[PDB]
């Protein structure tokens, strides 16, 4: 943080700027930012909107956990003490690649066993090889829907000059019913609408009027950086600010070229760092959270979830301009974003084959009704025996339920075609997410309305020309369009077991996931004795605790 000034945000330190390939070069700071998480179960907790919730799971007694702040090249260490009654836990660091530190990913039944309750602990330590905005959450089923969530801000350079960094701005769905009850509900029923949408942890109740709108004070004439996150379990958001444009400087944790838009689509898990110029008249302006796609990717019972953007020195109160409804994004993220640091892949060479195809299908023949299958199999990870235990014991007999897609290719690009139930009854859009990598969104089926139920299968005769291998969007989460397909690509530079799943909590609970066992033969040697011992320590403590649990495992575990 030497040469980083408001006028020159492109610079950071010697050898490190916005054009430096962050996936291969990282600043040697030697600084460690430590945090302690205390997961406690609170019954009959008073919510931000005046409504009392039956049960919540909280980190350090707050709605969200600590705002993790570190610099590019720092090491983030977190001790997670589980003081919940029955539930196990883990903390997944979404957007953190976890380069050669696979066992710190937090994916239950994959990279670790769940940390046992009644005082169980584990200390996560990872290097911040990427700068930007990210988030953390539990990976114990849909436990993060109870409140085990928070934000990660790794400071670094930018693709546009700005004066003030307003920090994190998480927008999430809010349900009065607990996550485990909602997983049981969605197994046999269609997903419900949210009761409210929280902006920076606050929202107003549409029935009573209680609570408060989020208040962001803008300094007149200054460029402000705002880090918008979607920490939701199901809801996909469309965000807009009345009489203002937002300039995207980053998509997820990948800095992109300046892209000025009127509105932004945020899928579950997606982040967007924007530059907002306080260029308009001194007044209060509404920041609106709308829903497009015709309820194909969510909705809220709060008809107008909003936040207030207040200009400093201007009068207070509620904004008078209700605004103009934004463009219907049709449950799709923009593929116009072009990364600052480029990547190139041959797209003409692609051929649709079974070992590169991941068909997402909805099975309505079994018990329960909503069972999501990827390649004819719904994922069901083993909390007692993770995929890493198999790696450490030289065991290759992975169960069909673990959905292991073994990628043996070394440091090469791998192409993946994900099909969204073309022959099925109906289709829903899916926020596809990959652990341990930022993928290249090469292409998707034609942008059509989400509830249209229009189908598209990959036809090389029209679609090979629709792909872009010259600096395509690089991110950790993107939309799988309803009724169609999606083409992705990631370079195998990080040996480990990585989940690739839909980020809608109900869908991943239903089974929408695969496990990319990347370079298994290379993985075993890269695991330190410290990580192995600790992996085995937590698994032993969990295997001892499980027979005393009064509740069963109703879902996938992921």
Ligand X SMILES: *[C@@H]1O[C@H](CO)[C@@H](O[C@@H]2O[C@H](CO)[C@@H](O)[C@H](O)[C@H]2NC(C)=O)[C@H](O)[C@H]1NC(C)=O
Ligand Y SMILES: *[C@@H]1O[C@H](CO)[C@@H](O[C@@H]2O[C@H](CO)[C@@H](O[C@@H]3O[C@H](CO)[C@@H](O)[C@H](O)[C@@H]3O)[C@H](O)[C@H]2NC(C)=O)[C@H](O)[C@H]1NC(C)=O
Ligand Z SMILES: *[C@@H]1O[C@H](CO)[C@@H](O[C@@H]2O[C@H](CO)[C@@H](O[C@@H]3O[C@H](CO[C@H]4O[C@H](CO)[C@@H](O)[C@H](O)[C@@H]4O)[C@@H](O)[C@H](O)[C@@H]3O)[C@H](O)[C@H]2NC(C)=O)[C@H](O)[C@H]1NC(C)=O
| Window of 247-255, 310-318, 390-398, 464-472 that interacts with ligand X by CB under 6 A | 310-318
By beta-carbon proximity to ligand X, the closer residue of 70 and 166 is 166
Quote the least distance from Cβ 180 to ligand Z, whole Å: 3
- Binding flag, residue 81, ligand NAG (CB under 6 A): yes
Quote the least distance from Cβ 384 to ligand Y, whole Å: 12
Closest CA to 97 of 438, 405, 330: 438
- For 323-351, b/e burial (b = at least 16 CB within 10 A) is beebebbbbbbbbebbbbbebebebeebe
Task: Single out the residue of 71, 87, 235, 477 in contact with ligand Y (rule: CB under 6 A).
Answer: 87
CB atoms within 10 A of CB 354: 8
Closest CA to 482 of 509, 455, 443: 455
Quote the least distance from Cβ 200 to ligand X, whole Å: 4
Task: Single out the residue of 189, 260, 279, 320 in contact with its own copies (rule: CB under 8 A).
Answer: 189
Length of the chain in terms of residues written: 558
Task: Single out the residue of 38, 202, 217, 243 in contact with ligand Y (rule: CB under 6 A).
Answer: 217
Please choose which of its own copies, ligand NAG, Cu ion, none residue 502 contacts, taking the beta carbon within 5 to 8 angstroms, the exact cut-off set by kind.
Cu ion
Q: Could you tell me if 79 and 90 are in contact, meaning their C-beta atoms sit under 8 angstroms apart? A: no
Please choose which of ligand X, ligand NAG, Cu ion, none residue 435 contacts, taking the beta carbon within 5 to 8 angstroms, the exact cut-off set by kind.
Cu ion
Task: Single out the residue of 11, 81, 295, 314 in contact with its own copies (rule: CB under 8 A).
Answer: 295
Q: What is the DSSP string of 18-29?
A: TTS-TTT-----
Please choose which of its own copies, Cu ion, ligand NAG, none residue 205 contacts, taking the beta carbon within 5 to 8 angstroms, the exact cut-off set by kind.
none
By beta-carbon proximity to its own copies, the closer residue of 59 and 268 is 268
E-assigned strand segments in 408-495? 413-420, 430-434, 439-444, 474-475, 477-480, 485-491
Q: Could you tell me if 15 and 177 are in contact, meaning their C-beta atoms sit under 8 angstroms apart? A: no
Closest CA to 281 of 322, 319, 246: 319
- How many whole angstroms separate alpha carbon 189 and alpha carbon 193? 12
Task: Single out the residue of 74, 180, 252, 518 in contact with ligand Y (rule: CB under 6 A).
Answer: 180
Angle, alpha carbons 183-184-188 (nearest 5°): 105
Residues 145-164 binding ligand NAG (CB under 6 A) are none
Please choose which of Cu ion, ligand Y, Cl ion, none residue 286 contacts, taking the beta carbon within 5 to 8 angstroms, the exact cut-off set by kind.
ligand Y
Closest CA to 290 of 242, 335, 245: 242
Phi, psi of 218 (to 5 degrees): -95, 135
Angle, alpha carbons 550-515-423 (nearest 5°): 100
- Per-residue binding letters, 192-231, with its own copies (x by CB under 8 A): xx--------------------------------------
Residues making contact with Cu ion (CB under 5 A): 94, 269, 430, 435, 499, 502, 504, 507
Q: What is the DSSP string of 85-136?
A: SS--B-EEEET---TT-GGGS--BTTTBPPBPTTTEEEEEEEE--S-EEEEE
Residue 503 labeled ligand binder: yes
- Binding flag, residue 553, ligand Z (CB under 6 A): yes
Quote the least distance from Cβ 166 to ligand Y, whole Å: 12
By beta-carbon proximity to Cu ion, the closer residue of 488 and 504 is 504
- Residue 400 burial by CB count (10 A; 0-12/13-18/19+): exposed, middle or buried? exposed
Helix (H, G, I), strand (E, B) or coil at 428: coil
Total chain residues near ligand NAG (CB under 6 A): 19
Residue 137 labeled ligand binder: yes
Q: Could you tell me if 171 and 199 are in contact, meaning their C-beta atoms sit under 8 angstroms apart? A: yes
- How many whole angstroms separate alpha carbon 361 and alpha carbon 187? 15
- Binding flag, residue 548, ligand Z (CB under 6 A): no
Distance of CA 176 to the CA centre of its chain: 22
Contact positions vs its own copies (CB under 8 A): 188-193, 291, 294-296, 299, 301, 303, 325, 364, 369-370, 425-426, 448-449, 451-454
Binding site, annotated residues for Cu cation: 92, 94, 137, 139, 430, 433, 435, 501-503, 507
Contact positions vs ligand X (CB under 6 A): 166-167, 169, 200-201, 214-217, 308, 310, 312-313, 316-317, 354-355, 358, 375, 405
Contact positions vs ligand NAG (CB under 6 A): 38, 40, 61, 81, 83, 166-167, 169, 200, 214, 216, 243, 280-281, 283, 385, 393, 395, 397
Binding site, annotated residues: 92, 94, 137, 139, 430, 433, 435, 501-503, 507
């Amino acid at each position: 943080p030497t040469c980083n000034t408001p006028s020159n945000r492109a610079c950071w330190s010697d050898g490190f700027d916005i054009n430096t390939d962050y996936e291969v070069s990282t600043p040697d700071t030697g600084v460690t930012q430590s945090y302690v998480f205390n997961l406690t179960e609170v019954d009959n907790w008073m919510g931000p909107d005046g409504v009392v919730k039956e049960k919540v799971m909280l980190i350090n007694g707050n709605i969200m956990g600590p705002n993790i702040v570190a610099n590019w090249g720092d090491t983030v260490e977190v001790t997670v003490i589980n003081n919940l009654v029955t539930n196990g836990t883990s903390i997944h660091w979404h957007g953190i690649h976890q380069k050669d530190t696979n066992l710190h990913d937090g994916a239950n039944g994959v990279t670790e066993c769940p940390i046992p309750p009644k005082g169980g602990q584990r200390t996560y330590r990872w290097r911040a090889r990427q700068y930007g905005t990210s988030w953390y959450h539990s990976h114990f089923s849909a436990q993060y829907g109870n409140g085990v969530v928070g934000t990660i801000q790794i400071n670094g350079p930018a693709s546009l000059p700005y004066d003030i960094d307003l920090g994190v701005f998480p927008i999430t769905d809010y349900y009065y019913r607990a996550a485990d009850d909602l997983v049981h509900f969605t197994q046999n029923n269609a997903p419900p609408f949210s009761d409210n949408v929280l902006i920076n942890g606050t929202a107003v109740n549409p029935n009573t009027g209680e609570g408060q709108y989020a208040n962001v004070t803008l300094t007149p004439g200054k460029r402000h950086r705002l880090r918008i996150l979607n920490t939701s379990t199901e809801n996909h958001f469309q965000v807009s600010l009345v009489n203002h444009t937002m300039t995207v400087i980053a998509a997820d944790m990948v800095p992109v070229n300046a892209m000025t838009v009127d509105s932004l689509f945020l899928a579950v898990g997606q982040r967007y760092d924007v530059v907002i110029d306080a260029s308009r008249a001194p007044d209060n302006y509404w920041f609106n959270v709308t829903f497009g796609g015709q309820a194909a990717c969510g909705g809220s019972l709060n008809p107008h979830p909003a936040a207030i953007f207040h200009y400093a020195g201007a009068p207070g109160g509620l904004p008078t301009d209700e605004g103009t409804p934004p463009v219907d994004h049709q449950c799709l993220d923009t593929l116009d974003v072009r990364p600052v640091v480029p990547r190139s892949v041959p797209v003409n060479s692609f051929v649709k084959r079974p070992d590169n195809t991941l068909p997402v299908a909805l099975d309505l023949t079994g018990t329960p009704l909503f069972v999501w299958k990827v390649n004819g199999s719904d994922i069901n990870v083993d909390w007692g025996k993770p995929i890493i235990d198999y790696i450490l014991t030289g065991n290759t007999s992975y169960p069909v339920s673990d959905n292991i897609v073994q990628v043996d290719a070394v440091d090469q690009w791998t192409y993946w075609l994900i099909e969204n139930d073309p022959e099925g009854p109906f289709s829903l859009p899916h926020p596809m997410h990959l652990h341990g990598h930022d993928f290249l969104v090469l292409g998707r089926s034609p942008d059509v309305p989400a509830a249209s139920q229009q189908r598209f299968v990959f036809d090389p005769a029209v679609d090979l020309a629709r792909l872009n291998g010259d600096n395509p969007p690089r991110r950790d989460t993107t939309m799988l369009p309803a009724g169609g397909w999606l083409l992705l690509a990631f370079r195998t530079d990080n040996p480990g077991a990585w989940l690739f799943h839909c980020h809608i909590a109900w869908h991943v609970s239903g089974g929408l996931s695969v496990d990319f066992l990347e370079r298994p033969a290379d993985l075993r040697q890269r695991i330190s004795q410290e990580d192995e011992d600790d992996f085995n320590r937590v698994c032993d403590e969990w295997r001892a605790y499980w027979p005393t649990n009064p509740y069963p495992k109703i879902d996938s575990g992921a």
